[PDB]
């Protein structure tokens, strides 16, 4: 096998302004999917190798959390970094998070979450598959999620605080083995739209639909980069391109959904495929899938009932058919 080490700062964890459990990060670990901070270059070699080999593994995984504030200056928030073994959305609570492998961190303190291969091993004798075009379950691998609990307060003024709380650093070492010739996957899009208006549609037995304004950076990036939505029975045709969507904003709390998937959006991240034709006017529309495998298998989330928040969306191009 061939190895590749990499250490990078991923971004920052902000203050908790809602007093509820807030999601602040969802870090994909798959080598062709793993994400840099803007103008970061540490993971380029990892993506490159991920496109050249058919199987990958992690030898170790450290997430270092560096406080951006002093512990006596800011109070009332606990940070919880945890391992999502399969990169699968779930309906969890703070307590559920605590049932995962995880580390809690007090505001104003530093800490490092360290994981062993035992914790990170794939189903192929410890290995995972690299090619995100062809499978999810044996391919996607683990994720690091970060949440927070408790309204972040300035201790001097006993007021709401709103700055960054932690620097987030990831250190790992990917190993690769077996061959592939997939330059398809070297250019996957990873981006963010801070100005996206969003809505959800559906009726009993129909797919959950996500509408996004047709002029938005998100929308006009997805159309350009997705293949053409010509794939199929009593459903629309979808693009074969899957996107992971991550909504870290508290404004994601104002998104209503038809039953029974309000939990999935409330959870902050899910998968989508561009669907053909128009659904809401002036919008581009997507089917929503509660797992990556469901997206690849065209098994969309189906509503059971019926019933324009501008939010911010981190999105990741999952594949390149
Ligand atoms: Cl909760
Ligand atoms: Cl809870």
**Do 282 and 188 meet the contact criterion of CB atoms below 8 Å apart?**
no
Distance 121 CA to ligand 1 centre (A): 28
Half-sphere exposure of 260 (CA within 13 A, CB side): 3
Distance 77 CA to ligand 1 centre (A): 14
**Do 202 and 240 meet the contact criterion of CB atoms below 8 Å apart?**
no
Rounded CA gap, 172 and 236, in Å? Answer: 41
Tokens (6 digits) for 236: 């629309």
Rounded CA gap, 168 and 110, in Å? Answer: 10
Distance 105 CA to ligand 1 centre (A): 17
Q: Identify which of 102, 99, 64 has the alpha carbon closest to the alpha carbon of residue 80.
A: 102
Q: Identify which of 281, 303, 320 has the alpha carbon closest to the alpha carbon of residue 235.
A: 303
Rounded CA gap, 50 and 228, in Å? Answer: 25
Tokens (6 digits) for 273: 């495929």
Distance 11 CA to ligand 2 centre (A): 26
List, edge to edge, every strand of the sheet that includes 102-106: 22-28, 143-149, 78-84, 102-106
- The angstrom resolution of this structure is 2.6
Rounded CA gap, 136 and 219, in Å? Answer: 24
Rounded CA gap, 113 and 270, in Å? Answer: 25
224 φ/ψ angles, rounded to the nearest 5 degrees: -65, -40
Rounded CA gap, 177 and 164, in Å? Answer: 39
**Residue 6 Cα to chain centre, angstroms:** 20
Distance 22 CA to ligand 2 centre (A): 12
Q: 3-state SS of the chain: helix, strand, coil percent to 5?
A: 15, 40, 45
Longest Cα–Cα distance in the chain: 61
Question: CB-based contacts of 215: which residues, under 8 Å, 6+ apart?
Answer: 282
Strand pairing report for 2-14 and 128-129 = unpaired
Given the structure tokens 């190895």, which residue do they identify? 3
- Using DSSP's 3-state secondary structure scheme, residue 231 falls into strand
**Do 24 and 152 meet the contact criterion of CB atoms below 8 Å apart?**
no
> Left if phi > 0, otherwise alpha if psi is -120 to 50, otherwise beta: which for 39?
left
Rounded CA gap, 273 and 236, in Å? Answer: 11
- Specify the CATH number for the domain of residue 16: 2.60.120.20
Environment of ion ligand 2 (residues, CB < 5 A) = 93-95
Q: How many helices (H) and strands (E) would you count in the chain?
A: 6, 18
Burial of 185 per CB tally in 10 Å (0-12, 13-18, 19+): buried
**Do 95 and 33 meet the contact criterion of CB atoms below 8 Å apart?**
no
Distance 120 CA to ligand 2 centre (A): 25
Domain span including residue 73: 2-185
Would you say the C-alpha torsion 89, 94, 96, 99 has a positive or negative sign? positive
Rounded CA gap, 303 and 261, in Å? Answer: 7
Cis, peptide link before residue 25, omega less than 30° from 0: no
Distance 253 CA to ligand 1 centre (A): 12
Distance 23 CA to ligand 2 centre (A): 14
Burial of 282 per CB tally in 10 Å (0-12, 13-18, 19+): exposed
**Do 177 and 127 meet the contact criterion of CB atoms below 8 Å apart?**
yes
Q: Identify which of 96, 115, 15, 104 has the alpha carbon closest to the alpha carbon of residue 65.
A: 104
Q: Identify which of 64, 76, 306, 99 has the alpha carbon closest to the alpha carbon of residue 205.
A: 306
Strands (E), the chain: 2-14, 22-28, 53-67, 74-75, 78-84, 102-106, 111-115, 128-129, 143-149, 153-154, 159-160, 164-179, 190-201, 209-213, 243-246, 269-274, 283-289, 309-317
Per-residue b or e along 7-19, where b marks 16 or more CB atoms closer than 10 Å to that residue's CB = ebebbbbbbbeee
Rounded CA gap, 169 and 123, in Å? Answer: 27
Distance 147 CA to ligand 1 centre (A): 10
Distance 102 CA to ligand 2 centre (A): 15
Given the structure tokens 């189903």, which residue do they identify? 123
């Amino acid at each position: 096998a061939i190895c590749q080490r990499a250490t990078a700062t991923l971004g920052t964890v902000g203050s908790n302004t809602s007093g509820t459990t807030e999601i602040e990060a969802c870090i994909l670990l798959n080598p062709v999917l793993v994400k840099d901070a803007t103008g970061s270059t540490q993971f380029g070699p990892v993506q490159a190798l991920g496109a050249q080999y058919s199987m990958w593994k992690l030898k170790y995984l450290n997430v270092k959390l560096t406080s951006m504030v002093g512990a006596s200056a800011v109070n009332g928030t606990v940070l919880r970094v945890s391992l999502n073994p399969t990169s699968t959305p779930s309906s969890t609570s703070w307590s559920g998070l605590g049932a995962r492998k995880h580390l809690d961190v007090t505001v104003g303190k530093n800490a490092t979450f360290k994981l062993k291969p035992s914790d990170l091993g794939g189903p192929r004798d410890g290995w995972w598959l690299t090619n995100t075009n062809d499978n999810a379950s044996d391919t996607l691998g683990p994720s690091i999620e970060i949440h927070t609990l408790g309204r972040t307060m300035s201790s001097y003024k006993n007021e709401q605080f709103t700055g960054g709380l932690f620097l987030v650093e990831l250190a790992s070492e990917w190993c690769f083995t077996g061959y592939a010739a997939n330059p398809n996957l070297v250019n996957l899009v990873k981006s963010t739209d801070n100005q996206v208006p969003v809505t959800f549609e559906g009726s009993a037995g129909s797919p959950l639909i996500m509408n996004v304004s047709e002029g938005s950076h998100f929308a006009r990036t997805v159309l350009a980069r997705s293949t053409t939505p010509t794939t199929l029975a009593g459903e629309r045709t979808t693009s074969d391109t899957v996107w992971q969507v991550l909504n870290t904003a508290v404004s994601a709390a104002e998104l209503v959904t038809p039953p029974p998937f309000n939990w999935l959006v409330k959870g902050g991240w899910w998968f989508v495929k561009l669907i053909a034709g128009r659904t809401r006017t002036g919008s581009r529309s997507f089917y929503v899938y509660p797992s990556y495998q469901d997206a690849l298998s065209n098994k969309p989330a189906l509503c059971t009932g019926s019933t324009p928040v501008t939010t911010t969306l981190q999105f990741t191009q999952m594949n390149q058919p």
